[PDB]
């Protein structure tokens, strides 16, 4: 129904509001336990944070963590969490390879082979996808948008990981949606950029890192 989709959109906005209030609350009492800060925001202690305790209309239960602040709902999978999880799985795999080349089977130890490992061993139903409510809110495509990693130089000491989303499950490194892992934000532009063949965040004289580019290219900006 339009009811269920609305519940999903509403919950997303809830989680973003929870995130902002937690962030503000932590900056307020900088020297007090963060889990306790999170608990009071979630429960709307003394009506201080919201008009009422945030509740998911689909009956989900909210959680929030501190690394940067992230919020989840047990009934509404969140695209930022999915991106973070993908980013960390690739980072773990890169660290594992650094101790043991054989963790990737076969002769080829490239980005596609690291991704294949992730698909075979963890994401067995394929890459996770950007939730419809996030797409509706932020003006993204009806197309299924696959949240997925690109590993730059995964066998080397300057390995980096970028998570992005496009309508392909592989073989296309151009994207208009890039997840900036450092900011907790998706970036969107209308002209796609390639995430391949260059570092997430180390610029050279002639080749700007993906991160530099998403923050400086024209038509590019933050979404959430
Ligand atoms: Zn929810």
Rounded to whole angstroms, the Cα distance separating 123 from 128 reads 8
Q: In 3D, which of 93, 61, 95, 96 has the Cα closest to residue 75?
A: 61
How far is Cα 42 from Cα 62, in angstroms, rounded to an integer? Answer: 8
The DSSP code sequence of 111-145 is HHHHHHHHHHHT-TT-S-B--HHHHHHTT--SS--
Strands 160-166 and 146-152 come out as antiparallel
| Distance from the alpha carbon of residue 64 to the mean position of ligand 1, in angstroms | 13
d(CA 23, CA 65): 11
Given in angstroms, what resolution was this structure solved at? Answer: 2.0
Distance 91 CA to ligand 1 centre (A): 29
Q: How was this structure determined?
A: X-ray
CA of 21 to the centre of ligand 1 (A): 17
DSSP-based three-state secondary structure for 34: helix
Query: Residue written as tokens 């509403």?
Result: 10
Distance (angstroms) between ligand 1 centre and the Cα of 58 equals 6
Report the C-alpha gap between 222 and 215 in whole angstroms. 8
Pairing of strands 146-152, 69-73: unpaired
User: Any bridge partners for residue 71, and if so which?
Assistant: 64
CB atoms within 10 A of CB 118: 19
Give 105 Cα–ligand 1 centroid separation in angstroms: 39
Measured in Å, residue 10 CA sits from the centre of ligand 1 at: 8
Q: Which residues surround ligand 1, an ion (CB under 5 A)?
A: 11, 56, 60, 73, 75-76
How many angstroms separate the alpha carbon of residue 78 from the centre of ligand 1?
Answer: 9
| Cα–Cα distance, 94 to 99 (Å, whole number) | 9
CATH number, domain 78-224: 3.30.1690.20
The three-class DSSP label of residue 146 is strand
Q: What phi and psi, each to the nearest 5 degrees, are found at residue 99?
A: -110, -15
Cα(43) to centroid(ligand 1), Å: 15
Output the CA 80–ligand 1 centroid distance in Å: 14
What ranges make up the beta strands (E) of the chain? 62-66, 69-73, 146-152, 160-166, 174-180, 185-194, 221-222
- CATH 3.30.1300.80 range(s) for the chain read 1-77
Domain with CATH 3.30.1690.20 in the chain: 78-224
CATH of domain 1-77: 3.30.1300.80
């Amino acid at each position: 129904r339009n009811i269920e989709k609305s519940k999903a959109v509403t919950c997303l906005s809830n989680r973003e509001n929870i995130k902002t209030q937690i962030v503000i609350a932590m900056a307020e009492e900088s020297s007090k336990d963060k889990n306790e800060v999170i608990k009071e925001v979630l429960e709307n202690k003394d009506g201080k944070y919201f008009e009422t305790e945030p509740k998911c209309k689909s009956g989900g239960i909210y959680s929030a963590t501190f690394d940067k602040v992230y919020v989840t709902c047990t009934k509404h999978p969140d695209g930022i969490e999915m991106a973070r999880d993908i980013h960390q799985s690739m980072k773990d795999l890169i660290a594992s390879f650094a101790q043991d080349p054989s963790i990737i089977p076969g002769a080829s130890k490239g980005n596609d082979d690291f991704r294949k490992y992730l698909l075979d061993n963890k994401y067995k139903n394929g890459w996770p996808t950007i939730p419809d409510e996030f797409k509706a809110k932020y003006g993204l495509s009806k197309d299924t948008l696959y949240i997925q990693p690109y590993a730059y130089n995964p066998t080397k000491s300057d390995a980096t990981v970028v998570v992005f989303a496009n309508n392909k499950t592989g073989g296309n490194w151009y994207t208009s949606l890039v997840y900036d892992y450092d900011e907790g934000r998706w970036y969107k532009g209308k002209n796609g950029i390639s995430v391949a063949g260059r570092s997430w965040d180390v610029d050279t004289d002639s080749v700007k890192s993906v991160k530099t580019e998403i923050h400086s290219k024209e038509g590019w900006g933050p979404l959430n």
